[PDB]
Amino acid sequence: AEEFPVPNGFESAYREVDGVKLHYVKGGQGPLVMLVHGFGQTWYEWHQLMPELAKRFTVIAPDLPGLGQSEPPKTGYSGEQVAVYLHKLARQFSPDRPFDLVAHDIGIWNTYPMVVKNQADIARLVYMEAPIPDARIYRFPAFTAQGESLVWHFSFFAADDRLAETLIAGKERFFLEHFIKSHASNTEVFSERLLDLYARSYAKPHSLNASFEYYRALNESVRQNAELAKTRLQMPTMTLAGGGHGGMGTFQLEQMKAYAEDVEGHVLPGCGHWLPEECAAPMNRLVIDFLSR
Amino acid sequence: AEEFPVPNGFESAYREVDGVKLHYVKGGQGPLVMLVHGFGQTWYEWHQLMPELAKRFTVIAPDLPGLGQSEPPKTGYSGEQVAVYLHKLARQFSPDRPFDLVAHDIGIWNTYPMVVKNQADIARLVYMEAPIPDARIYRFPAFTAQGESLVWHFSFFAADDRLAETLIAGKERFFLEHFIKSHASNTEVFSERLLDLYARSYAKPHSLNASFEYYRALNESVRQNAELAKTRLQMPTMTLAGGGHGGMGTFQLEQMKAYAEDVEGHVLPGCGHWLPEECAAPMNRLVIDFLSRGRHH
Numbered sequence: 001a002e003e004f005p006v007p008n009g010f011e012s013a014y015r016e017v018d019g020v021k022l023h024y025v026k027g028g029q030g031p032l033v034m035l036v037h038g039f040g041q042t043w044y045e046w047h048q049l050m051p052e053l054a055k056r057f058t059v060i061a062p063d064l065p066g067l068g069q070s071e072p073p074k075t076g077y078s079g080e081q082v083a084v085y086l087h088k089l090a091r092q093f094s095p096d097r098p099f100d101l102v103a104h105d106i107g108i109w110n111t112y113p114m115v116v117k118n119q120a121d122i123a124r125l126v127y128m129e130a131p132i133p134d135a136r137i138y139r140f141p142a143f144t145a146q147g148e149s150l151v152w153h154f155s156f157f158a159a160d161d162r163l164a165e166t167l168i169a170g171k172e173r174f175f176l177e178h179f180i181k182s183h184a185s186n187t188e189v190f191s192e193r194l195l196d197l198y199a200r201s202y203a204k205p206h207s208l209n210a211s212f213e214y215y216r217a218l219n220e221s222v223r224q225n226a227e228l229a230k231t232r233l234q235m236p237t238m239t240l241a242g243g244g245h246g247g248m249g250t251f252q253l254e255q256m257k258a259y260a261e262d263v264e265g266h267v268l269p270g271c272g273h274w275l276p277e278e279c280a281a282p283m284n285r286l287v288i289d290f291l292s293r
Numbered sequence: 294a295e296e297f298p299v300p301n302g303f304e305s306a307y308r309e310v311d312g313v314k315l316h317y318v319k320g321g322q323g324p325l326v327m328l329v330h331g332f333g334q335t336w337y338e339w340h341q342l343m344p345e346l347a348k349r350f351t352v353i354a355p356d357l358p359g360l361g362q363s364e365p366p367k368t369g370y371s372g373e374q375v376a377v378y379l380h381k382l383a384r385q386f387s388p389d390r391p392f393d394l395v396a397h398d399i400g401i402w403n404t405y406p407m408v409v410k411n412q413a414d415i416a417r418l419v420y421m422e423a424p425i426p427d428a429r430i431y432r433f434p435a436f437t438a439q440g441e442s443l444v445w446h447f448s449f450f451a452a453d454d455r456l457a458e459t460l461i462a463g464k465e466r467f468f469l470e471h472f473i474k475s476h477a478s479n480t481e482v483f484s485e486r487l488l489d490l491y492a493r494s495y496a497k498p499h500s501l502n503a504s505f506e507y508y509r510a511l512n513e514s515v516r517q518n519a520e521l522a523k524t525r526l527q528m529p530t531m532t533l534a535g536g537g538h539g540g541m542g543t544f545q546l547e548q549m550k551a552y553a554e555d556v557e558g559h560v561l562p563g564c565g566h567w568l569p570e571e572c573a574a575p576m577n578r579l580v581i582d583f584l585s586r587g588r589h590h
């Protein structure tokens with residue numbers, strides 16, 4: 001059965017890529033746009049964007065390996081390894097023309113390498129609410145004068161001994177609610193049913209582990225990206241970031257400027273980290289307009 | 294009942310201070326030295342140092358409010374509030390003479406205010422392995438090129454909704470072993486037996502909660518110390534830090550130089566955060582020698 005409700009006119013389906021059965025939800029007609037979710041979530045965070053975007057594009061939203069209904073990666077969880085699966089998946093549906101990429105949160109981590117290495121395959125790029133893993137992440141503070149910092153979980157999740165799985169097991173719903181809301185400006189959008197759905201999904205033991213394995217591979221991703229970044233991105237790029245509590249603000253664009261030649265950026269006041277849910281209407285509009293140019 | 298074995302010729306006792314029953318272990322004879330433990334531990338971390346000190350000093354090792362066998366504080370958990378309990382306790386056993394102070398980890402947070410506010414009561418001072426709460430702690434990284442950073446737990450522990458209690462309760466022994474060993478260079482000293490003793494103590498629900506309340510009061514302690522630090526410490530001071538994995542390295546001395554006029558520091562190689570256990574011989578020697586420069590025996 002489906003973990004999340006599929007919007008009318010879309011199909012939930014699977015493709016094997018490099019021996020890994022990936023789940024995705026797909027609909028629309030026209031050139032391909034792939035939407036990639038991040039931590040704590042699945043394809044479903046894009047469910048409000050999808051029907052609108054489907055009016056002009058074929059839309060595909062995969063579950064990251066090990067998350068949602070996708071199988072764990074057989075290679076590893078570093079960005080360069082995971083990006084392979086997402087690239088090949090996109091190419092099954094757009095073998096003959098470039099496709100657009102939209103990524104949120106660790107979806108960025110898991111797509112940047114395939115973008116920079118296959119630039120001819122990427123027409124336009126939208127990145128929102130996560131740093132590309134580089135040495136900038138080592139400057140983020142453990143603790144702040146206002147208390148709990150925004151990224152202390154980097155260390156919690158990266159820790160060995162399965163620290164995170166062990167503490168969070170049986171308390172997935174409680175932990176996820178805290179994590180989402182502490183990174184949100186608009187908390188009201190996360191209803192009990194929505195949180196139930198997400199918690200149920202990432203609580204599958206292989207998915208709870210998959211979640212943290214992305215973070216255990218984070219330093220490897222940074223090292224990979226140090227080499228990859230020698231080539232700047234040449235395709236038109238737009239960044240989005242929340243300007244409210246939990247958001248990344250000016251960091252998103254300012255980082256991307258070091259990576260891309262052709263970038264525009266927006267900061268959305270009153271919005272936190274979870275842009276597609278906290279601020280669906282302006283986020284959708286900005287993405288649709290940027291891609292429809 | 295005793296959570297930890299009391300060394301021969303020491304007494305385990307309790308003292309009511311401002312409505313709070315504080316547990317302590319005491320022995321020896323001579324001028325007073327108070328030893329103040331930190332997070333994850335109790336008076337017991339000092340148990341190898343104590344019989345050696347007791348040959349030259351009256352030694353007292355209290356359990357911090359809410360930890361070990363001490364009741365939670367009734368005022369609050371900021372450094373300034375908790376310091377009142379420890380200062381009054383010490384002064385009961387040394388009402389007419391200054392005493393010595395040795396503090397490890399959050400023992401520092403909980404003693405600094407009474408040291409700076411009662412400088413004449415403190416003859417000599419030894420601080421090891423924690424920052425004094427100030428704005429420097431806002432500069433420590435959440436994540437490092439080597440993996441989990443050394444103070445990410447500050448935010449974990451300080452988070453609202455009782456995040457840390459809810460996640461950790463029932464898994465106290467697991468968490469502690471990871472926490473201690475990840476902050477250690479010499480991990481081998483933390484036997485399963487020793488980890489069992491410590492975990493048993495902080496698994497007491499009021500103790501697990503008290504542990505975190507110290508971090509929930511950290512910003513307040515930072516604000517308190519900003520005022521208090523306008524006057525430097527005048528008594529002889531020594532800092533110790535671990536040079537190995539989990540230790541604070543040169544940070545300890547460098548921060549202290551901003552706080553004290555008279556400070557000598559040591560960084561112990563091959564030792565991490567838990568100096569009394571990981572590096573017992575050199576640490577004990579450094580502490581005994583430093584305190585023995587003054588009146589004793």
Ligand SMILES: CCC(=O)Nc1cc(Cl)c(Oc2ccc(O)c(-c3ccc(C(N)=O)cc3)c2)c(Cl)c1
Nearest residue numbers: 039105106130140141150151183246247248251273
């Ligand atoms: C511009 C520099 C500055 O002065 N401050 C600053 C400080 C920090 Cl902690 C910072 O990082 C941020 C912020 C807000 C955030 O929601 C996040 C964030 C949260 C979760 C993930 C996840 N799924 O792994 C990734 C990321 C990071 C950024 Cl981007 C900027």
Ligand SMILES: CCC(=O)Nc1cc(Cl)c(Oc2ccc(O)c(-c3ccc(C(N)=O)cc3)c2)c(Cl)c1
Nearest residue numbers: 332398399423433434442443444539540541544566
């Ligand atoms: C990368 C930045 C850099 O240049 N230097 C640096 C980096 C870090 Cl992560 C750092 O933090 C450290 C180290 C060693 C430590 O034992 C601690 C530490 C751990 C727990 C407590 C407790 N009271 O719970 C107090 C203290 C912090 C220190 Cl002091 C310096």
